[PDB]
């Protein structure tokens, strides 16, 4: 029944996966122990020891430190897949 290898997926918190509503963007609270790049600014998003609360988009598939939202940075842009 299993004859299709994935591409290294990631199953975040299933208990309570909320969604950060924003300008055409619905980010999701999750962590990334692997090298993840933020969509907002141009900095690395990840951590081997203590992974910061990263927000992944449940549409175009992106990531942005929860910090950006908590700080409200204009750098963040609207989702692209939600229009094209
Ligand atoms: Zn950033
Ligand atoms: Zn998006």
Number of domains in the chain: 1
> Is residue 20 situated within a structural domain?
yes
d(CA 17, CA 83): 24
Q: Domain of 36: which CATH number? A: 3.30.60.20
Closest CA to 57 of 34, 33, 30, 35: 30
Pairing of strands 63-65, 20-22: unpaired
Cβ-contact 36, 21 below 8 angstroms: no
d(CA 42, CA 36): 11
> Taking the C-alpha atoms of 13, 19, 25 and 30 in order, what is their torsion angle to the nearest 10 degrees?
-20
> Is residue 5 situated within a structural domain?
no
Q: Which long-range contacts (CB under 8 A, 24 or more apart) does 69-73 make?
A: 69/20, 69/22, 69/27, 73/40, 73/41
d(CA 4, CA 12): 21
> Is residue 23 situated within a structural domain?
yes
Which residue bears the tokens 């929860």?
66
> Ligand 2 centroid to 79 CA: how many Å?
4
Which residues keep their CB under 5 angstroms from ion ligand 2?
57, 59-60, 79
Those residues whose C-beta lies under 8 Å from the C-beta of residue 53, and which sit 6 or more positions away, are 29, 31, 65, 66, 67
Which residues keep their CB under 5 angstroms from ion ligand 1?
38, 40-41
> Ligand 1 centroid to 9 CA: how many Å?
22
Technique used to solve these coordinates: NMR
């Amino acid at each position: 029944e299993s004859k299709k290898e994935p591409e290294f997926p990631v199953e975040p918190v299933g208990e309570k996966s909320n969604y950060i509503c924003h300008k055409g963007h619905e980010f999701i609270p999750t962590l990334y122990h692997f090298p993840t790049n933020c969509e907002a600014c141009m900095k690395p998003l990840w951590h081997m020891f203590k992974p910061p609360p990263a927000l992944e988009c449940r549409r175009c598939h992106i990531k942005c430190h929860k910090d950006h939202m908590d700080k409200k940075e204009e750098i963040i842009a609207p989702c692209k897949v939600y229009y094209d």
